[PDB]
């Protein structure tokens, strides 16, 4: 009678990267903000989803791959994260462009439920 | 065993518009803040719900139509957005009046689940 | 194939009131913050849950009744709000004490689903 | 036709404690932020989940036990809180390390649903 959902959270991860499908955006890196939640039900004893690796992988994939659409980044990153942590039962990833519009915050996300 | 929910997000979209059912409010434009989430399961290849158009449409409809109740704006905007993006499975739209009361933030929303 | 949930929202409604079960707290009014969401499926034509009345009623009940526990306020206010707006399908009300502890924000809430 | 979920909330509880599995982190206390939601359906008359005790217990367990992984703290604290308040139907606890990385906020959580 007990359902336990563990999460690891990396929120407001901010760094600069080439990202975008419009030519003007790809001239120089721009500031983005990433939120990631990884959920699971059980790991091995003393095992953990290391937030250090997780943050470094997200930056590594974005900065090197220089994705076009945010949706392209979400597709690749989510598949990479699930392959690396097969135990996860749910993934939520949102990528926001902080400065692309002065009057709003825009972004795209993916929520994946694995059964 | 995999359910994927993609989202496009325009948050804290701030602009001035005529809005309101009380006569005093309609004399001059007032500052509002709009949050929109559009969710879907699949688009065509390299297709995307362009946050640029989405933001411009919301401003265009509010500024030109000069809605009375927030609920009138929500009714019209949601129907417009779904007609324009029939693929969406869920829409969340919230419109807030930033300055109408000095001691709170008031607003109205609509969450629509399409099956 | 369409489920529409309308909401009216009063967030971060801040005012001073007598509130508390500890004697020291009831000597003078203290600063609180109230969040209220009222959800419904349908109203009459051109009818609306007026956020003006809603905000004024919450302040009126808190300031006059000088509740003991936050839970006492939530019990009374929720019953009052549902009786006044029988059409609501869901109510969420959270009351927070802003200054009662310098190192956290504490509060209590009620979520009510009506069927 | 009425389902009522009461909550007690301690949010952004900030204090310093020894916490961490990396040797450098355990040399000195670091700033953390804790969010706790406790939900229930019914208590006795005039009974309440005292946010004062709750906040003090969380600080007491963290500062004295000097947990290794955040997940170790979550495991212990959640079991302690449920044992102390058997009436709870749902617990959400998130612990975040405020300064461990300058470019993000990292943390871990547990959501437990009791039936
Ligand atoms: N959804 C979406 N819309 C966009 N519009 C303009 C530029 N980039 C994008 C993008 O990356 N995603
Ligand atoms: N729900 C709601 N209440 C209101 N009250 C006053 C003014 N406008 C409004 C409005 O636009 N919506
Ligand atoms: N849950 C709860 N706990 C409290 N603890 C101390 C003071 N007041 C309260 C109160 O109003 N509610
Ligand atoms: N999930 C997780 N990852 C970590 N990585 C580094 C250091 N501590 C931790 C920790 O406490 N939890």
Residue numbers in the entry:
A (entry chain A), B (entry chain A), C (entry chain A), D (entry chain A): 0 to 114
Please give sentences taken from the publication describing this entry:
Dihydroneopterin aldolase (DHNA) is essential for folate biosynthesis in microorganisms. DHNA catalyzes the conversion of 7,8-dihydroneopterin (DHNP) to 6-hydroxymethyl-7,8-dihydropterin (HP). Without a counterpart in mammals, DHNA is an attractive target for antimicrobial agents. Like other DHNAs, the active site of HpDHNA is formed by catalytic residues from two adjacent subunits in a tetramer.
We have determined the crystal structure of H. pylori DHNA (HpDHNA) in complex with a pterin molecule (HpDHNA:Pterin) at 1.49-Å resolution. The M1-E114 sequence of the HpDHNA protein folds into a four-stranded antiparallel β-sheet (β1, β2, β3, and β4) flanked with three α-helices (α1, α3, and α4). The HpDHNA:Pterin complex forms a donut-shaped tetramer with four identical subunits related by a four-fold axis. In the tetramer, β1 of each subunit reaches β4 of neighboring subunit with 11 hydrogen bonds, resulting in a sixteen-stranded antiparallel β-sheet in the shape of a perfect barrel wall. The pterin molecule is buried deep in the active site of HpDHNA. It is recognized by the enzyme via π-π stacking with residue Y50 and hydrogen bonding with residues D49, L48, E70, and I69. Although pterin recognition by HpDHNA exhibits common features of ligand binding by DHNAs, the exit of HpDHNA's active site is blocked by residues L21 and I51. The contact distance between L21 and I51 is only 5.2 ​Å.
